């Protein structure tokens, strides 16, 4: 059908159904905005496969997400939200930007999880905001940021645990969220190595990093955190 | 044994008295923009930013704000409260201006329906960066009830000053303020409140400010010579 929107990442298509979108996951790669692209055969598929085993673990335990179920080795069928334009950020352990706003090592522990809020907003770098400047651009109200904040925290401590179960740290991650057909708020978008990061007891980076910083092939590594994730239940 | 430098800044030095919580700022006919980068002396301008900041803590403290001021004691000195530093540049803006206006890729001068409230995590070794909350109680500045004080204070000297300043014909597009505890561990304004950490525009959209020296427009000492003349008309 129509290709709603052509991302970084993903294609998103209609369906027949007003309410439901089919997501395509590209074998496309980007880091910096850019430049940094670049195609990885087999990325789209092992992205899908993570987030499509992640969603539907996620609507197991009772988080309202857009998730209905895989489709293809490329494609999964999605509630069609608005998109709340934050890229919502939590994080376990100090990494990447947090690190040099604070000039600190990565890999310190934060005794409690810190949220972010950027704006998702490419023309402008997707700039770190702050609660006041939400209300500004007119994104959300002091009830649904409170609701943002505390939907990520409780999705934080079901992932940290399940890929500590299979060893893994969950160091930090990225969300987004939207309003669905009946007007809440639901976690969508998706959830992969691209947008997490992940260490292995050894500080191994199990994720975009990989790419980031040129540490070696992508889809090695995203393949070791599918094999090590089809170990859960 | 009464007169020690205990520190050396940008703009002010600051030193002992005989008296432990009380301490004279010296305000230097020095100008800085870019964390370093234009680096200028610049004659007279230590005496206006003294006699600016002076007289606005004086009218601040008359309203009932509390501040470290204690009096203007020289053309450059001035005897202060001795505070401990909240290591935050608590930023106001009425107005679009400078780096919101970079962050949010808006124009300069667009009237913000409610004033915005930022946090800069003062450090000079990281280019003091934009903080959120959560980042100020990471950093042990500050919990949840003194960082709403901060804000609400804030608002509320912002409320004084922009009515001041209007009296007089400036628009007071943004400020920065400081704080500290002092020797009873209550929270006050201390700090400059100069054209140095305020904008400034007249009516015609002229910087009445240091962004004069930042943006390269007119002579800095020209132009803080005028909002003194025009500060004492509310006298
Ligand atoms: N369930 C959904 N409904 C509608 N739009 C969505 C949904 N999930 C994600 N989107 C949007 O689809 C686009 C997916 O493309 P992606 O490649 O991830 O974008 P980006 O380049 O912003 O990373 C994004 O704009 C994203 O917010
Ligand atoms: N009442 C006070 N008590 C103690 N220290 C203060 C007081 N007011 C200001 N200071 C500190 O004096 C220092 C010197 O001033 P300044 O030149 O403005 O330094 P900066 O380069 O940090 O702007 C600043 O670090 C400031 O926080
Ligand atoms: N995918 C994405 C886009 N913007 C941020 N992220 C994710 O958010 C976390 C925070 O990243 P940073 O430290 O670079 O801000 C990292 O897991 C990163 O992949
Ligand atoms: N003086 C100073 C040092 N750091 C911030 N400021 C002040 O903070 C306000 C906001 O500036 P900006 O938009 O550049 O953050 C301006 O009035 C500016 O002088
Ligand atoms: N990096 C984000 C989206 C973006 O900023 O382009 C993601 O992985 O979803
Ligand atoms: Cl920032
Ligand atoms: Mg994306
Ligand atoms: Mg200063």
Request: with cysteine; hydrophobic share 40%.
């Amino acid at each position: 059908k129509q290709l709603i929107y052509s991302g970084k990442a993903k294609d998103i298509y209609t369906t027949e159904d007003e309410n439901l979108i089919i997501s395509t996951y590209k074998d496309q790669a980007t880091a910096f905005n850019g430049v940094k692209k670049e195609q990885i055969a087999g990325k789209g598929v092992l992205n899908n496969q993570i987030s499509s085993f992640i969603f539907e673990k996620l609507n197991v335990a009772g988080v309202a997400t857009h998730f209905v179920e895989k489709l293809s080795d490329t494609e999964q069928l999605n509630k069609k939200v608005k998109i709340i334009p934050l890229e919502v950020v939590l994080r376990n352990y100090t990494a990447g930007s947090f690190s040099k706003r604070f000039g600190v090592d990565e890999g310190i522990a934060l005794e409690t999880p810190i949220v972010e809020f950027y704006y998702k907003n490419d023309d402008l770098d997707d700039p770190f905001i702050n609660d006041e400047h939400v209300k500004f651009l007119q994104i959300a109200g002091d009830q649904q940021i409170a609701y943002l904040k505390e939907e990520t925290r409780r999705i934080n401590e079901l992932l940290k645990v399940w890929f500590a179960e299979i060893g893994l740290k969950l160091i930090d991650f990225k969300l987004e969220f939207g309003f669905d057909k009946d007007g809440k708020i639901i976690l969508a978008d998706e959830f992969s190595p691209d947008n997490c990061r992940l260490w292995d007891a050894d500080g191994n980076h199990m994720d975009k990093d990989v790419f980031r910083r040129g540490l070696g092939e992508l889809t090695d590594v995203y393949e070791i955190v599918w094999e090590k994730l089809q170990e859960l239940k």
